[PDB]
Structure 1
Amino acid sequence: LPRRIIKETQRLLAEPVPGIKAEPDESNARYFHVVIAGPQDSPFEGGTFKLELFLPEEYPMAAPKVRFMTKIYHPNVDKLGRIKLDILADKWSPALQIRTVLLSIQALLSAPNPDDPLANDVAEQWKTNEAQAIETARAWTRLYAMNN
């Protein structure tokens, strides 16, 4: 289990990021149970958004795989909870770490860009009706994100 992985993992558990809980998994360590906070001033406010994050066996030459588990009404997330973020694909570097990926996903909840691949008729709703998209997102946050 490459030493880098281990060092990153400990510099998360020791040095947390606020509103971002990330522990490793017991079954297999290359695999993290992430939980991101619905950010300030976003329609996702006060939501418990659970994520699964996984390190492929070419980490860090290749980027991590990250997927939402909690359903959320957002252009750059899809049906099965995968995300469109360039630091997870187009512009990744071993410079970046787990924590950077997790901070940029948090940033994405505060800046939902309707320029997705087609982001459903959800990005189409965001670009043609921001009012009711903010609303719906606030509903999926309440009705799927409040662990309560």
Structure 2
Amino acid sequence: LVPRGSMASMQKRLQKELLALQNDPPPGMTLNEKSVQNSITQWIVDMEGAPGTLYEGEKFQLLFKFSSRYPFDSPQVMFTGENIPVHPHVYSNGHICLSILTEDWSPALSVQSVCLSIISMLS
């Protein structure tokens, strides 16, 4: 069951539709009741591969997503769109494997420092 409080800040239509998935989902589907989030802010940062690197001339997009618990909660940052960097620490789905985004996140850090780590990753 979805925590009740997770419906406090939710638009009335989204409440009915969420509960319909909880209670009478379509065949083969189950709501992840721990997955519900509200008051998310997001934006996209365009990123150019740096001169002299393996990514020179490449145009990437970085999606930043901030939960209602940011900055205590780490931001969700991933590469998005049709051109995703080819790098061991980036998955095909755009997911980024950097510790700053997981174990080493702290509200002392910032969007700027995440950008710098990502720049660093691509060199």
The TM-score normalised by the length of structure 1 is: 0.53
Instruction: Give the whole-Å Cα distance in 2 for the aligned partners of 1:32 and 1:103.
Output: 17
TM-superposed deviation, 1:59 = 0.3
Structure 1 unpaired stretches of 5+? 1-27, 111-148
Q: Does 1:107 align with 2:120?
A: yes
Q: How does 1:82-93 map to 2 (within 5 A)?
A: 82-93=95-106
Give the match for residue 59 of structure 2: 48
Q: Tell me the amino acid that sits aligned with residue 82 of structure 1.
A: H
Normalized per residue, the structure richer in helix is: 1
Query: 2: CA distance between counterparts of 1:39 and 1:47?
Result: 8
Give, in whole Å, the separation in 2 of the partners of 1:84 and 1:29.
22
- Which of structures 1 and 2 has the bigger CA Rg? 2
Question: Does the aligned pair in 1 maintain the 2:62–2:79 contact within 8 Å?
Answer: yes
- Please list every run of at least 4 consecutive aligned residues from structure 1 whose deviation after the TM superposition is greater than 4 angstroms: none
- What TM-score, normalized to structure 2? 0.63
Percent sequence identity is 36
Q: 2:50 maps to which residue? A: 39
Q: Which amino acid aligns with 1:56?
A: S
CA distance in 2 between partners of 1:103 and 1:36 (Å): 11
**Root-mean-square deviation (Å):** 1.5
Question: Is 1:59 aligned to 2:70, yes or no?
Answer: yes
- Equivalent residue in structure 2 for 1:78, among 91, 116, 119: 91
CA distance in 1: counterparts of 2:108 and 2:90, whole angstroms: 25
- Count of equivalent residues: 83
Q: Secondary structure at the match of 1:32?
A: strand
More contact order relative to length (CA 8 Å, sep ≥ 6): 1
Instruction: Tell me the secondary structure at the aligned position of residue 61 of structure 2.
Output: strand
